[PDB]
Every structure is written in C-alpha cells, then in structure tokens.
Amino acid sequence: RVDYSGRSVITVGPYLRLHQCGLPKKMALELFKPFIYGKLELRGLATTIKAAKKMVEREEAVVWDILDEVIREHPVLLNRAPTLHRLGIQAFEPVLIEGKAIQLHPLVCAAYNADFDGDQMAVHVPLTLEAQLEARALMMSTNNILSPANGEPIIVPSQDVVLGLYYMTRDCVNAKGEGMVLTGPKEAERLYRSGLASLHARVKVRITEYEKDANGELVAKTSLKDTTVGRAILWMIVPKGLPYSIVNQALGKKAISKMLNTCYRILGLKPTVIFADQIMYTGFAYAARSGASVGIDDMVIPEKKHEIISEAEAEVAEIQEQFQSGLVTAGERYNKVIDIWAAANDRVSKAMMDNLQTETVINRDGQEEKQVSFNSIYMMADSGARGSAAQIRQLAGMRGLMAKPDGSIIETPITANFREGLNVLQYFISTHGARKGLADTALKTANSGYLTRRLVDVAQDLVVTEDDCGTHEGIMMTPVIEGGDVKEPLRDRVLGRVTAEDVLKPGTADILVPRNTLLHEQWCDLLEENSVDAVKVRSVVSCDTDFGVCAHCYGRDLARGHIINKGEAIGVIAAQSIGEPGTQLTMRTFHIGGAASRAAAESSIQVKNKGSIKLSNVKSVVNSSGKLVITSRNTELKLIDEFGRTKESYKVPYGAVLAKGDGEQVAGGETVANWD
Amino acid sequence: MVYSYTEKKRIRKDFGKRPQVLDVPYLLSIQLDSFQKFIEQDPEGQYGLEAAFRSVFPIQSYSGNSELQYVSYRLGEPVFDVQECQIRGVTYSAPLRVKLRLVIYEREAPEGTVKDIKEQEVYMGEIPLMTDNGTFVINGTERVIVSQLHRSPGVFFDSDKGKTHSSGKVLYNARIIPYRGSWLDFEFDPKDNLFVRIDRRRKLPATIILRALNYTTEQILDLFFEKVIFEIRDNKLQMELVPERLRGETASFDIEANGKVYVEKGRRITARHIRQLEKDDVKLIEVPVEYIAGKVVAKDYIDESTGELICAANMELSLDLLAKLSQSGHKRIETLFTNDLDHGPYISETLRVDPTNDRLSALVEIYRMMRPGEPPTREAAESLFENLFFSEDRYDLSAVGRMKFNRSLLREEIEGSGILSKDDIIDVMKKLIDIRNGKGEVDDIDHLGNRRIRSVGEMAENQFRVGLVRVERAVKERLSLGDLDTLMPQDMINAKPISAAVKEFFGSSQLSQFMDQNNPLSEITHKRRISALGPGGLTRERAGFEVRDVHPTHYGRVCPIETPEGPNIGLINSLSVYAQTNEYGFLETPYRKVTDGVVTDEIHYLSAIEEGNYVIAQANSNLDEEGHFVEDLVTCRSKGESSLFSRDQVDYMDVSTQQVVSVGASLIPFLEHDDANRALMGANMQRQAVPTLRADKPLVGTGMERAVAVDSGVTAVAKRGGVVQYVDASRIVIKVNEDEMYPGEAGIDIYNLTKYTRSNQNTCINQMPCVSLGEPVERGDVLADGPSTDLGELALGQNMRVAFMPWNGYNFEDSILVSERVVQEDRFTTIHIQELACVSRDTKLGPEEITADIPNVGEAALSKLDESGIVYIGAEVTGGDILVGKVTPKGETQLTPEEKLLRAIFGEKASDVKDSSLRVPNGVSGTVIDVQVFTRDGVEKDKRALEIEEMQLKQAKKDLSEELQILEAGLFSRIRAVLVAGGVEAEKLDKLPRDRWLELGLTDEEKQNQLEQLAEQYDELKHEFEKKLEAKRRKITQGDDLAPGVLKIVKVYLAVKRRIQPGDKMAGRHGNKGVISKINPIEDMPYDENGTPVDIVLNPLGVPSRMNIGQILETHLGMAAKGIGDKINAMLKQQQEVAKLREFIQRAYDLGADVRQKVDLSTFSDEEVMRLAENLRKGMPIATPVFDGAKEAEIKELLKLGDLPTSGQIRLYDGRTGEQFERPVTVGYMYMLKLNHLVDDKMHARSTGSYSLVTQQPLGGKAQFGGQRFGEMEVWALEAYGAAYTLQEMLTVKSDDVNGRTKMYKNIVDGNHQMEPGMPESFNVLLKEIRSLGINIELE
C-alpha cells in the first residue's frame, strides 16, 4: 500500500516547464508536515513540536511562505496506476496552483500514455537523499528523453502543436503584404501591427545561418531566402544552427518532429534541451490565435458518390441477375460483389480526397487561381495532428463493411454518410462491429499484461557487471531486404554496435578491429561506400563474460546519453517493457500480423532496384521451352545493383518458371516468375 | 383534441413527419404486470401462489388416510405505509391468509369421515409487495430485481461442433430441458450410435435405457424401422418393390417384373431404367436366393421345427443359415432396408454394444450408474426409473415445455401432459435419427425464439414453491406420525420455510439488488434490464465469443446500444420502448398490419418466430393519403437480411423508428449522425449524472423524456385533479371537481411531499410544486418535480455557453475548460447526503445511555450537544467532532467503590472509559438534515426524538383535521341549508351555533329526523374521527422492530454542498467526458461582437479523432434555440405587446414543413402559451426524434431566421489581448453533464494511518490511510528505471519494517536522511507460514 499519496486526477498545465508540477495547495502541506515541523524547528519560528503542530493545525498564513521555501526544490514523483515502462514514474519540481487537481505537462502525458477521460493518478512523495536526488539525476523527464524501445527520442508534439505549426508554416497566393524588406524582427512589427498576415508567400526576408562544421566553434552566415512570415516566426524559436527554413520549416508536419530529432542530434543537453518548449509555447499560442473550428461547411461531400453507388448497384444487380440465371456460383458472386463494393468505396474515397484539396477555393481578385485549402479537416489529415484518411473516409465516403459473428464482409453496404441519415440496420451492424471492437480492445490489455508477466519473470537475471571482455564472436549484419521494397536499412541495425571487423566497401580499409561504432563513424561508413551492406558487429547474445553481460559488447544507449555503464537492466526491463506496447493493441482484425498467404515472391517475384537478378544457392536448370527453373528446392533470388549492394532478395522455391534465369537485368517492380 | 393542459407551461417543439399511432406504454408493465399476476385470484389456476398451492395440495401422508385440500389464499393489508415504511427502515410485507382445509378418513373403513375440518387462517411467512414505481421495500432499501434471460424449456436442436476437438466434423446432439429436475440429452460418437447423457453422467446406449422403457428389440426395429415385406412359399422368395424408396442398385442377374425385365443384368441403374419400373404399377416379384444373405433381418423369426433361439433379430444372415431358416417352414420374413443415402444404420450399435437386454438389468445398471457408492438392491429401481424419467413431481414441463415440445414435435394441440412420454422420447429419437440422417434444420442457440425472460412472478413462484415443498415434508411427517389428527393445520404448519424462502430470496439474490439513483433516467433504465447472470445463462465468468455476439433477433426488442461496457459485455440488455412479454415469456414487438395495397391502423405484437417468416418494411418509408406507398420498390426485410421488395411483399410496418433503441439511449438526439460507438459510450455515461440545484429542461431533446419523467414515478402526480386549494413545500392539497367522484366518504385528495432525503447514491431528492394555486388540474398532471426534473420534463444536466477553440494549450485531448461565470452562477452545485449511524448498546455490563455526558472531553463538544439530548438540527460538524454522544458501562464497579460512586470518575457515572461516542470521521464536514434515531416500545426518559414524535402528531392531526373540517363543515352547511323555511333566521344563524337550537321543532318530522340525524352523524364523525386519530397516534408512538442485538438505534442524515470543481469531470450526450484542466477568469474568455465571454472551451480535434458528429448540430441548433429565446427575451426587454410577439412565436412553432400538430394561439390566445412565452424567455425547447431528427436544411433555416449568421460561425475577439482570431469560429450551446467523479470523492491524500495485524500492511483506500498501491507493474517499473533504492526500501521500509519508519521519522529531525533497510516482517510472515508448514526453516 506504499505511503504518502495524494491519489489525484490529471489536469494539463500548458505553461511553466516540461518538468514541474502544478501540485496544488490542498495536496500540499498534508504530506509535507514533517518538513514543516523540521522547518519551523531549524528556522526557529516555533518553540516545541506540539507548538508547531498547533501552527499547522491552525492553518496560519506564515506556514505557506516556508512551505513554498520547501516545495520549490523538493521534487514529486508521478506515475499512472496501469504502469508499463520505465518512464511511467518521473520527478517534477512542484509549484502551487489553486485547485484540487494537478496540472500536468501534455507532452509528458503522451509519455505516461495517460488520458484526461478521468483515469486516476497515484502521487507519491520521495524520501530525502536517494529518492529526491536519484530522481533528480536520473528520472527527470528532460534527463530521460530517448526511449529504450524504439530507440528514437519519444516526444509527441501532436494535436494543436501539429495544427498550430501547420497553420504557422504555409503559403498563400496574393492575400495581403506581398513581400517584405524587413527580415529578422518582422514578426513583432509586421505581425502585431497590421497589414501582414500570419503567413504570406514570396517574402524576401533574409535568414542568418550558423555552421557547426568547425571544431568547437560555430561559423555564422546570412543570405536572402524566400520564406513565409510564420516560418520566420518559427525560426526565432531555436537560435542555434539550423537548416534555416529549408528542413527547419517544411509544411508544419511530423517533419517538425524530424527537425526536432536533427536538432537533438547535436549536444543533447543544452539549449537543444532548454527553450525547445518554445515550439510548444508558439504552437498552442498561435494555434489558439488561429482558432481552428469544425462545422457543417468544413466537410465536403463528393457528387460522384451518387454515380459510384448507382453504378456499383447496377453491376451488383447484374451479378444477382446472373446468379438468378444460374451462370454464377454463390461464392464467386459473393466475393465478386465484395470486390465491386470495395473498389467502389475506394473510388468514393479518392473522389472525396480530390474534393478535399482541389474543390476548396479562395476568392481573391479574379479567383481563377484560388489557393491552398484552409479546411480544418485537411489541416488535420495533411498535418497529422489527429484523424486519418480512413476515419475521414467514414466521415464523408463509405464506412466499410465487417461482421462480428460471421467474420465476412456483409452484402448490404452502408451508402449513407455521417451527415446523411443512417439506416436503422446500418446502425445495427455498426454497433455490432463496434461492440466487437470494444471487446477486443478490452481483451488485449490483460493478455499484454500477462505477456509482460512472463517476459519480465524471465528478464530478472541480468547483472550486467563486466565492461568489455573482448569476445571475438559477433553477428553478421545484413539488411532484411524482403518484398518489393526493403523494410529497413542496414545502417539502423549496424548503428551503435561494437564491431569485431565490419569492413565496409570491397575490403579496402573501412573500420579497424578496435574501433567503436558511433553515429558519425557509422553514418560516414553508411553514406560513403554503401556497396557493402553486410558488416560483422558484436551483439549482446555473444559475450565472453562469465557472469552478467558486457556493456561494450551489447551496445551503448539509454534514456540518457550514450556510453552506458554497468549495473543497468538494459534489454531485460527495456525489452520487457518494449514488448508491452506492441501486444497492447492488435492491428486491424489481427489477421494482418498473421500469415497473409499473399506475398511478393509468392505471387510474382519483383525487384527493387534495377540490376542483375541472380540465384544464390541454386542450380540453374534450362528447359526446352526457353524458361528457367531451379533444380534444387530452397533457392535464393536477389537483385544486385551496379555497386554490388543487395536491393531485394527473396527465397526462390522449386517450381518457379522465370523468363530470364541469370545474365539479364530488372527494373523497379519487375516480375521474373509468376506462380499461382 | 390537443388539450395539453399540463404541457401548456412548456411546449417542446417536435420535428419529423413520422407520426406515432401507438402511444408510449406505461413501460413498467413487465414488473407491474408480473406483480399483479403474481398476486391474483383466478379459477383457471394461473402461475402464482394458486398454482403452487394447487401443485403441492392436496397434501396427504402415506397410508395415513388424511388429506389436505387448498382453500387457496387471500392477501391482506401491510402494517406500515410505503413512504412511511421506507422512512422507518423496516421490510415491507403483507401477511398471508386463508389457510388450507384438512380432511380425515376412517381407518379400515371406506369413505368413513368423522367430521369436516374447516379451520381459520394461520399466519405463514411474509409476502412483500411492490411500489407503483416497481421497487421493493426491505429494510429501507430499493430492492429491484433485474429481468432474467435463459433457455426456454423445450426440445433443442443444437449443432455443437467442437473447435477444440480437432475432429473437424459436426457432432449433432439434442437435449430436453424441463423447467425443473434432471436433464436428458443424447450424444453422438464417431461410432454412429445414439447415446444418452443424464445430469453429466456417462452416456449409456439407447438400447439399455429404451430397454428400461420395456420395449423389446422386435418393437425397436418394427417401431423405429419399417420391416418392409419378405415372403417365401416353396422358396419362391417373392418381395414387394420399393422403386421410390432408394436410388441405386447392384445387379448380377436379370430381374423380371410381371413377365418383363425391369433391369437387365449389368444394365444401367440410371433414372431412365428407374422410372420405367417406378412410374408403372408393379407388384411383388421373385428373385434368386443370393439376395437374402446380403440383407439384414428385421423381425425375429425362429424355426418352427425346434425351439432354438437361432435367427434372432438384428443379426447378419449367413449362406449356410439361409438353408436352416428357409427350410424351417417360416410363413413370412422381415428384412431391414439398411442402405445409406438419406438414412443411416442407427440403434444397431446400441443394440450390439448395450450389455443389458432386459428392463430389469437395465434399471439395475442405470441405478449403479446413478449411485457409485451403493450397489443397486433392485427394489427401488422402479421408483428411480419412473421418478427419474416420467413422473409428475420431477418433470415440471410447465407451459413452454409442452408448447415447444409440441411445436418442435410437429403436434397439433398445444396442451399436453406435464411428464415425459415414451412415444414422445421415441419421436425425439426418430427425428434425431433424421438429424443424423442429414434431413432437417438445426436451431440457433442465440435465437431468442428459443429464449424466454423470467421475472419476479415466476422466480418468486419457484422459490416460494420450493419453500412450500419444504413445508410439505414436515407436514407429511406430522400427518404420518399420528393416525387421526383433529385440527391438524394449526401447529403443524411452520412459517420459517416460507419466510426464509421469500425473505432470503428477495433479501439476498444475484438479480435482486438496490439501485444507485442518479436522475429518474438511471432509475427507469436500471428498472428495466436483461440479465443472463444468476441461475442459468452464464457460460463462463470471463471471455466467450458467440455468446456475447448480436443476433438478428436483437433488432426490435433488446437494445444493442445500451450495454455493460465494463468487464462483462453483451450480457445485460435493455428492452425496447414498445417491447412486451408474451404469456410464455417470449418478447413481442409492434408491427402495423397492411391489407392489400392500403395500410390499416391496427398494430399486432409479434415475437421472433412469428415475425421471422413475415416481411416487414424499413422503419422510414414514403406514405400517401390513399394508404399506398409512393415508391414501387420499398426496402423490406424477411429473414436475416433486407432488400428492396415489391409493394405486395410487405406484410407489416415498423411504425416509429425508435423500436430498436431503449429508454437510456433514446434520449440522445441525432443518433443517426453520431457514431454508434461514441453513442454507446454516452448512453453508458447518462446514468451517472448527479442532480443539481436548478433543473433547466434541455433545449435540444427528443420528447420521450416527457413520458419518461411522468412514468418514472419520481415526480409527484395528481389523482382526480381539480381546483387547488392550499400549497406548500411539505404538503399539497387539491379540491376535486364534482365531475367524477365517489358518493361515499366525500373528502378531497391530499398529498405529502417528501423533503430532502438521502438516496442510495448519497444524492439529494425532493419534489417542488409546479403550480401556484387555484389552477385546475386534470387526471395525470404532475404537481411536483423530483430531483433533476423541471415541470415534469427530465433535465439531469445544465446547458451553458459553448465555443470550439484551442486556448493557450489548456485544452488538450478531452480536457475541458470552464469559466468562472458559471462558477458564480451556482450552476452544477449539488447536495451529497451521507448518513451517520452510531448503534451499539447490548452490553452484559449494563445498558448504554445516549449522550448526557461526553467523558474525558471539554465543553467544546458539550456546547454543540444538548444537555439531555443530541446536537441542534442543521449545525456545523467539522473534523472529528462528536455528532451524537454515546457512553458505555466499561469497568462499572471496582475497588474504591467505583471510585467512590463515580467521584473520581467525575460526572459520567459509568465510571470512566466510554468509547461509544459517534466521533464523526475526519475529512467529512457538512450540515445535518434530520436525526431519525430509533423508536422502541415501553421506552421512557428519552429527550431525543421528542420533537419529531410531537411533529408527527401535529402533522397527522393537521392534515386529518383539515378533512375533518371539510366533513363537519359540509354537513353543518347542509344543516344551514335544510333549516330554511323550518324557522330560519339569518341574523341568528349567522351569529350562533345549534341552528336555532338544532333546527328548532318546525313540523315535528324535521325536528326528530333532522335534529336527531344531525346529532347522529355529527357525533359519529366526531367520535369516529377521534377514534381513528388515536388509532393512528398509536401507530406513531408504537415504533418499529429494532434489531435484537441493540437496545437503541441512532441514525442521522448529513448534507454537503459540492459545486463545480477544478478537477471534477464533465460529460456530453454524444460520449465525450473529460476532466477540467483549470477554471479561468471571465476576463480571459474570448468575446463576440457583443462582448459575451464564452463559458466552455472544448477541443475540436476530438470530432474527427473520436468520430463525434452530433456535437456540431447540437451546438449550432442550440445556438438557434437560444437565439429564439434571446430575441423573445429582447422583446420582453422592450416590453412589446403580446400580439406582436405572438406572431413571431407562432412563426417559431410552425416554421418548416409540417413535422408537428401544434398550433399557436388556439386556446383563447391571451393566456396559457402567452405566459409560456415568459416561461421559455430563457431558451427554446426544441426536440428531435432519435432517427427522425432535424436536417441541416431546417437547422440553418431556423438559425438563419434567428438573425444569426447561417454558417453558425461568429467573428470573435480575444478576451485577453483583445485582438481578433483569424477566420470565423464555430460556437453554440450544448447540453452538458455533471457526474460523481468529482475529486473530493475520488481524491484522498494520506501519509500514515491504521495498519492491519496481518503482515503489518494497511487495509487500503477509503480508510483515510495508505499510499494507495504501487503493484508488481510498479515493481518492474522501478526495476525498469534501474533504481535499487526506491524499490528495495519501497517494499520494506513503509510496511514490512517498523525500523524503517521509526528510524526514518527520527532522521527527519535534523534530517539525517538515512532509511533503515530492515528485515521485512512480511517476509517474516512468509517465514512464519513456512514454519507452520511441516518443513520449518530457521536462520543461522
């Protein structure tokens, strides 16, 4: 049952600092009573312990001042009750806010996964040195950014930050202000005065640049770049060296999180860390100033919907007519009708999108040229703050079809948009499948929890004591290269791993034996001489250390900076918590994660990059018809470019008849063999 | 007609062109109907107490020559009242009367009877009753039983193909389920033999149990099978032809039929060769001998020469056996068909494998299979076989048993025997053999045609019947003990089985429970609920797949929307508004009849079985005045699907579109626009809304809540309405009109309003008068409003100003932003009434006196408490103050004789050490409502309760004295009327009583008759009124039955005002419910062109994100409504004439296309609706139907008529900086929701507190102690963060270690900061338990 808990409910402070607590005055001084007694003791405002107890029970106003003297630097650790990963508990610096709730940083709310629907909150008070100072030097929310699951720094500047920065960075034809000669301080006078819109196309305002390529020194620069006023506003956020509105502005999309990653790539402490919240302050600031809204006029219903539903209904009418005649079987007729309503729903979605961009116009002067659409639905879809093309497809276009009891697509589609009145049976099937979705999503939590039970019960065994034992065994690193396009590059797999040999390029020089692989060296060997995608890298699984694991052999990374030390759980708890979010929710009907039974090489073998397609570990057998077949059973079919790097490689099973076995070339999307 | 007297105050504007011909039923008729059929007297013997008394009765002992005949029963009046009984807190039950008559027969003498026995009624058990709202009063609780749903009795056809069996093939089975007793089922195995499973026991072959039915194998094959024909005369081997009985043949030789070959040797077996001998008429033919050996013999034929048993039935024939049989002189031979095409070789493996060939050994074997412990003695095998299979007591097929048994049996008459039948089970075996044969259709488990709901009537009939049998056992022992018993039904019948069965049934059951009361909505939708829990219907505690799904039978009766979104989903349901229960428990829903091409106005209720074959049109359709449909092809449904059908294919109609929704989700407008998932969430959130101070009827609505509020029984309605005389918050009286009255007793109808009273949800309830005075009241008009009700119209939440906006990041996800204006407007403020009871007494050391001292405490609490009594009513109780003083004897006497007669014990007198005081728990502070304490018999010298005991006498004397003055005054005025012309004197009679001296003498007849009569009924009403007044006062001062484990009970009501709160929570009608981030000042709220700061700020991103459509139309249409009310309010600011505003009001009513019958000014035009303008001056009551709701065309037309910009967007300025926000902004007015989620109730902060003797861990929350809990997920979260400190000292220092807490708090002084790691005492509980275990581990 622990101790010292407020058991509060989350509120969202936008203001103050990323790590700080809108701890309230009511939750305060209740758990701080010992610090108040010792405070009145050392300071001497009271006489005896009982007298201090009287001073606290009488709720004097003087107790509030010294209470603030304690609260400011006395941190509070916070966690949500359904805890999953290591960042669930974080230390903040509390400040009093009038109320019964706790104002919490929303960017941290996504880290906790907590929602504002009213889920409870467990508030504990740390005890003295090891707790306060350990959570101060370790568990702080800015001190821990990187997540040892995905490996990328986990920050969610979504919602009104994505929408607000989207409205910030964008252009418009004509409108007001044209170009501006003022450059650096154009937002204050131009924006706050009059006549200058928040965003204007074709502005000559110059932007100063900084080059960090020098050693321990920044090299300045300046030049005139065409950039919108809002982009000039966003540039004032980070004074440090940036691409200066090229990659630092873009469209105001997840690329803002990308430039946040590139900004965090250099000196991950520092004004890289601090003042980076100004993206949030301007995000909700000028997002609130924007004041996006949703209404009846916001959504657009395509007029092609009537023609598509009518044409599909006529085709299906011909299908049921052929079934009435007996020419078409019930199965092929059912799956066929499913195909026509599926492709027709896709048509309604595409026309929906067409009317989502090019139908929205703005009247200025002749108005023939119009302008980019200001619709909030399009700002959410393109920006990525929330929503998706499927949810919007249900808002305007067709809703799709599913059946919970049957498991097959129903033959009675929903032709009514949300704006239009839905049919009674349409609402019946929709609440059916929705109830099934609630049952599944409610079922996945317990199963994921049990999975974490097993995995975490296995993971307890990691001491991680010795640093480097110098083991020669390491895994050969090769890209996955599966399907038409490669799923992941080999640079991300080989990045940040000890390398026994790992010779890039045709064995010229590349890395030496005793060299660590960092982002700069691994990025240099990845960018320069990329023809070799296979490099031998030491792994955690292979370690010569008798007891525990070797940190140098496993790798260097953590929530904090690189070069991890011993005593860390590492992949034990980081992996046990990494598998929690994956199994927390199934993908679609969960048949996606299962065998799809349809693959690239299974239907028609395709190539990624243009090059010579060869068969590795196979015996080429020519036939009398001119085709080529593999004599062995398990074979390999790979596409090698001119440099020699593997583009796409798939196992070639026996029985595949190809037009050209070897010696020819292939382009993007080429099918060598086709087997049913 | 459209009188609308009670709705003239507020006429809610209705939309949609779909009329409702069938009005909303009283809708409680399932519980009210089940109750009124549960207590009834009928000659037909309907299910109930009469069915149980007739079922068990006559009660006759074995060989006792004594019988007990039933006089049935009659119910009496309870001792207490409904509201008064709920206040007293005692169970509400009426005694049972009309005991059964006895009988005596002479021993050894036939028909001899000494005398007839007719005995007076005897008290047996207590039968609780039901309130008009559908509740049950037991110990002052609500006690409502949830409706039950399970399998209806009858023959079941089940697929039952196991997915875990790996066989990949369907295994058919059928089980007959009686209403009571053992279950009988059949089981297949891959051996293709019919098996029998009874009450989970191992499955025996069909031949052993059917042999136990005393049917020989000859009757088995000759009955279940056809013997066909075989004839042999001098080995001619002639047999009949069955060309249509089989498709196939194997011909090794030619076969000639009547001089012509039907099928040549090796000829084709095709239908060309079949129909040649089939269509033509052919007789018995002669074929060679080799065809006998392949066929299987049917009947049992034995050789006529000698008596051997050879050639037994159901056996294979041998080539050498043909010579022994055919040459034995057999007259005829019967052979089995035994060819598998449409049939199968059933029962054969049962006959072969079945060990027992006889009924006796079969009964012994089934007895040994039933009882594993005792070998069968063969003596009771007949009683076990009969009572186990076919018997009157152990069958109980009831009604649906024989109804579904004959329905699936394909019989004709509905009525049948209530016990199992041999031909019936043989028919089940034959049709089941057809199921194994492949012909016939199986039945669905989830199909509600096989389901029947059970209610309080049938359930209480079952438990009460069980208790009645428990009585029949002991009474059977009493009658069997003596040979002749006179006046037997006196001490022989005991009330403990009845009172234990009904009082334990309604007292404790899974279905029976008290309700959490928030608004009348949660009370009515909690009153109507379908439950698969309890006995039957529960497959497993968790998970399950096909049981939780939704069948097409869920369309028009149960609501798929309303549902328990918590751990168990798809189980609890909610019946439709128009749904009803059939006589067998089936559920029927309305459909309008259609004859030829016109739609007749009659509507019939149809169940799933009847409506399954019929085709019914879609809910929405085009209608014409001639009755024909406008469109030729109308959307209709037949079975499990829907498609366009011709106008001649539509049998019935769906009437309203609300048949598929329930009362819970039916009040959410714009359902077709909003997504079904978020509508499900909102419908789940509607029940938790706490009632607030001021109830403002929703300006957006449906119009069903008008009937829900009046039909919920929460509001105070009026019977036989009339001209109101006196009004008050405590009481309301009405003078009844002379149109309809009873000739006797005269009088007027009086009503007692309930004051602020605690509910089970700790909320506040009360009723307030909607009428002023002198207003005519009709029958059914609501006089007063309950909690969260306004003018008989349900409002459980409050409207407020709405603007869609991000504001400075204070609104994120579902977070909510509330203005300080609503904070200053008292809105959302609610009263939470908690009850505090201090009840102990019961000490062998002497009784405990209430108050009169507080030991070891100063005068601070003595100032709040009275000297001889408890605290003042409506005081301020803060912290640990003592609300009711209570003492205890404790040590009582001792050496230094009780401290010299309590001298050193000061003024307590007990001695010292009384902990019995109430001592209000910390953290709870508020004002007290009323102290009900306790009322006992023969109690004296109690200063408490004196004021309320006097107040009840003054109340009953006041309201009874009113009727007394109406009576005596009426008859006195009749005296003043009759004395005319008999010696009248206005100046004398208008200044004196008697009436000149009792009407003087006049003409003799008027003297004695009129005067003696006036004195007769005068003293009769006076003395009778005083006698009834004393009879009522005796009931006031007699008290109730206190728990024997205490001398005196004390209970007090307390209330707290809790208003809008920063953390709090809020909910929408469309399912958005979130916490409030911070309450912002008015100056920081953006304002419009008129400078009106916005009250609420929500997140527009949740509309696309969470797929909530109805919020846009909600806020915009609400902005139109408050635009009407704002313009009319401006007219009142200008003090315009009635007519000038009357035109705009009428236009406001009739604008649009039809969609209502309402017409303004229709009645006198100068009152009613004219004042209703001043009623709606704040807002316009606009309603939309569920699926028939308003369209954006009429919404933008009305909002455009309200002078507001048609787009629904107004240019807005910042309240902070004053600058304008770019682009227009969507604003509006929507209906919001205040819940019980406030963080004063949710949030409790704690540091150190009480622990437990087990492991030294504290109990948990709600105890004002503990740190809540950080579980194993937090253990792995600290192992995840890599902190050894927080985890290690976590599990140890706080609970399992006292050293960590002592050394920790000691280190707080001077701040040593060290925490002792310690040795865990919980680990010493593990070492402890292991030490109790036989392997004890000790440290070295």
Numbering used by the authors:
A (entry chain D): 346 to 1021
B (entry chain C): 1 to 1340
Task: Share the article's original sentences.
The bacterial RNAP has a core consisting of β, β′, two α, and ω subunits (Cramer, 2002, Werner and Grohmann, 2011). The major variant sigma factor (σ54) forms a class on its own and controls stress-related gene expression, including heat shock, membrane stress, and nutrient starvation genes, thus playing important roles in bacterial adaptation and pathogenicity (Buck et al., 2000). σ54 brings RNAP to the promoter DNA through binding to consensus sequences at −12 and −24 and forms a stable closed complex that rarely isomerizes to an RPo. The activator proteins, which are also known as bacterial enhancer-binding proteins (bEBPs) and consist essentially of an AAA domain, use their ATPase activity to remodel the RPc into the RPo in order for transcription initiation to proceed (Ghosh et al., 2010, Schumacher et al., 2006). In this present work, using cryoelectron microscopy (cryo-EM) and single-particle analysis, we determined the structures of the RPc containing the promoter DNA from −35 to +28 with the characteristic fork junction structure of the RPc at −12/−11 (Guo and Gralla, 1998, Morris et al., 1994) and an intermediate complex (RPi) consisting of RNAP- σ54, the AAA domain of PspF (PspF1-275) in the presence of ADP.AlFx, and the promoter DNA.
To investigate how transcription is activated and how the AAA activator interacts with RPc, we obtained a 3D reconstruction of an RPi consisting of RNAP, σ54, the same promoter DNA as in RPc, and the PspF AAA domain in complex with ADP.AlFx. At least two distinct conformational classes were identified and the best class refined to 5.8 Å resolution, while RNAP was separately refined to 4.9 Å. Despite the lower resolution of the PspF ring, it is clear that the PspF hexamer is highly asymmetric and resides above the DNA with L1/L2 loops facing DNA and RNAP-σ54. Significantly, there is density connecting RI helix to the PspF ring, in accordance with the established role of RI as the major interaction site for bEBP (inset) (Bose et al., 2008). The concerted movements of β and β′ pincers result in the widening of the cleft by ∼15 Å at the top in RPi compared to RPc, in preparation for the loading of transcription bubble and downstream DNA into the RNAP cleft.
